Design a binder for this molecule. Sequence first.
Ligand SMILES: [Cl-]
Lengths: 107, 108
Amino acid sequence: KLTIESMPLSVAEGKEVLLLVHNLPQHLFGYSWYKGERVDGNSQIVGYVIGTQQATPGAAYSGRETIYTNASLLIQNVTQNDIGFYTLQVIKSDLVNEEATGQFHVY
Amino acid sequence: AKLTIESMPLSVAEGKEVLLLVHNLPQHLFGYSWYKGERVDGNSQIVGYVIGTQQATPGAAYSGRETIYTNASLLIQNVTQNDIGFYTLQVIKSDLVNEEATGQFHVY
Ligand SMILES: [Cl-]
């Protein structure tokens, strides 16, 4: 069951947070990370194809975000206004796909 | 400032992956070099990475497990049970008065 863990859960403003991914399913084509709680193209940070290892930024990419090979997302220079919701869509090879949302708390 | 390395996570299940994050990079950098172990030593170099060109070149200690990112972070996959966990970053400044820092993780 796919879930997202924040390291750390509470993030000092301007510091960085790692979003770790637990329980990735098998037979994956790639990952997509979104700012906020929903899978929405206008809030996409990155699309990442595993086989090619090609990250392509989406309209929400700000320069702060880095995706890793294990699907983890590092966000640097976290802003005070950030509600902290980030959403991962796992794209399976059969396209019956899964999502999970995590959040951190800025102070 | 003071350059330091943080393991995400600090304790790593054997065969899983660990991210070495870098804190307090100085300014006016030419690149990064990552080493296996506690010392800057060519025989234990994983990668040399030039920032401007984004060119990573592997060193003799590159095993296939290690990937350097543009922010200096190093991701190590398939961590072995025997791994003592020490990894060392050398930051190469443009004036060559350089800095090092060592981090470690603990395999279980
Ligand atoms: Cl150059």
